[PDB]
Structure 1
Amino acid sequence: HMPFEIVFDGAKEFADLIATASNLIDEAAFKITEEGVSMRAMDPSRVVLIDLNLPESIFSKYEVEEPETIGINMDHFKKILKRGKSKDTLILRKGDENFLEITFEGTAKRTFRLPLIDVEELELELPELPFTAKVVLLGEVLKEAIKDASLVSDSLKFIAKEDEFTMKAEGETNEVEIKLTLEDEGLLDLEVEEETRSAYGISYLADMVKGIGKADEVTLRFGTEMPLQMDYFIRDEGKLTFLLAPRV
């Protein structure tokens, strides 16, 4: 197999990015091409599809001789990456053998070897879906709304109308409603083709947003009785996309 070397400036930031996907994933196949790094995986229950796209442009050095796929234990990967410091340079290197060499370069050079595994590749595509509502909002609003809703229920209803986006949860001894309009600082964009209603499991939503930053811009696309697509951008050009099955 052909070697590669991939270098990312800011090892802690890369660890943070991986930790977001790791919240739902135990293991994943990483497709390494000359265009960038991609990872498409499902959580163990098959409710959430994760797609992480890291173009060559976000890496300070990118040397990929031929496209290849590697399998990674995501919890082992995250344990090693968590050792990286904020100003470390991260080097991901594969030689001829079946392990990933992970180097942090900073005040010292620290090199871990991570055994590569084989990950069953389900044929996963990200199909186009007839979403009728798009919402762009601040991470902090999304994160707090999911925490708010968890105080009352295990499911969160998403309601998009022309002028307002509402997330509402109801339980026996409580009720919570989070409302956004374009007058609100938390709502950056709202495009609604038609009144759209769908509900989503809070346990999955919590794991999806756990690593998202309070100042991150999160795009939500959904439809009535349809999955929720949730994405935010990494270093402008990278993209993390979640696709979440509705609660029906």
Structure 2
Amino acid sequence: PFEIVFEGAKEFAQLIETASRLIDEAAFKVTEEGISMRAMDPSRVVLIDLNLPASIFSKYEVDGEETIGVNMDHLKKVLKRGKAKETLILRKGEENFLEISLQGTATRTFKLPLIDVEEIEVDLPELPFTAKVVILGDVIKEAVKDASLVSDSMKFIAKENEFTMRAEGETQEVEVKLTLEDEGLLDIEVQEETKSAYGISYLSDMVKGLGKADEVTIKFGNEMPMQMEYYIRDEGRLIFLLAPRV
């Protein structure tokens, strides 16, 4: 029966909300190292991998390894009730329930019965990523919004010390370009010329909820899936794997 404590319950609520915007069910691994989760959206186009090392937890008491399956909607709604100052506690006794306790001016405890979510193993090997760029969340958020405004798909084109992202509509046109000398980008390293396209629905779903002062690392190449990832408390990490079009 493990016990976990996390300061800043609202951060965890936002993280789980972002992770649950694509998958309707999820199985979380509990281990000596930390929490872990992986799944695929029903359409089988985006892969979500989540890692929470034990270091980022105020307390972490685990005496084994197991998996807990919870319905994402119920957990999300329960976690939305935590204020920015609350401390979140997760525990599980020998009984088949999960207890979510929020602490502060008063103690409030919820009980969610575990479900039997089946396990499907999937992992992708390291891919040869010609181009790699790290940017801030706000610029990508606005760019995706504009592309959705005009067109239905986006194109990621990057060259030596230059990153641009276009969205050609039926008649209109959108062009956003940036350079390392600009504040939007932090660095670029392009092995060779690269370009690809991706859907706008999934991009809007995953990029939503990004903070202004957050660094996002994007890796992509020629007509192969793009990988986006950003860190949680300098040790956690959330990764997406968006497939290409055509």
Fold equivalence (TM over 0.5): yes
Selected match of 2:191 from 193, 197, 205: 193
Deviation string, structure 1 residues 37-86 (Cα, Å, up to 9, x no partner): 01111111110000111110110000111011111211111100000111
Residue type of the alignment partner of 1:22:
S
Selected match of 2:79 from 78, 81, 85: 81
Deviating 4+ runs (over 3 angstroms): none
In structure 2, the partner of 1:8 is: 6
Residue type of the alignment partner of 1:238:
G
Selected match of 1:71 from 64, 69, 72: 69
**Helix, strand or coil at the partner of 2:176:** strand
In structure 1, the partner of 2:204 is: 206
Cα distance between partner residues in 1 of 2:209 and 2:51: 16
Deviation string, structure 1 residues 134-172 (Cα, Å, up to 9, x no partner): 110000011111001001111110011112111111012
Q: TM-score, normalising length from structure 2?
A: 0.98
Residue type of the alignment partner of 1:207:
D
In structure 2, the partner of 1:126 is: 124
In structure 1, the partner of 2:95 is: 97
> Any gaps of 5 or more consecutive residues in structure 1?
none
Deviation string, structure 1 residues 110-148 (Cα, Å, up to 9, x no partner): 000111112222111132111111110000011111001
Structure 1 residue 225: Cα displacement: 0.5
Cα distance between partner residues in 2 of 1:64 and 1:47: 34
Cα distance between partner residues in 2 of 1:178 and 1:72: 41
The within-5 A match list for 1:221-240 is: 221-240=219-238
- Quote the sequence identity (%): 81
The within-5 A match list for 1:162-173 is: 162-173=160-171
Cα distance between partner residues in 2 of 1:228 and 1:118: 32
In structure 1, the partner of 2:29 is: 31
Aligned residues: 246
In structure 1, the partner of 2:177 is: 179
**Helix, strand or coil at the partner of 1:233:** strand
Selected match of 2:140 from 135, 139, 142: 142
> Any gaps of 5 or more consecutive residues in structure 2?
none
Bigger drift between 116-125 and 41-50 goes to 116-125
**Helix, strand or coil at the partner of 1:127:** coil
Residue type of the alignment partner of 2:183:
E
Selected match of 1:59 from 57, 60, 71: 57
Cα distance between partner residues in 2 of 1:42 and 1:88: 31
Cα distance between partner residues in 1 of 2:131 and 2:113: 43
Structure 1 residue 173: Cα displacement: 2.7
RMSD (Å), alpha carbons: 0.9
Q: TM-score, normalising length from structure 1?
A: 0.97
Cα distance between partner residues in 2 of 1:72 and 1:175: 44
Cα distance between partner residues in 1 of 2:70 and 2:162: 42
Structure 1 residue 233: Cα displacement: 0.5
Cα distance between partner residues in 1 of 2:2 and 2:141: 37
In structure 1, the partner of 2:17 is: 19
The within-5 A match list for 1:143-162 is: 143-162=141-160
Cα distance between partner residues in 2 of 1:217 and 1:169: 23
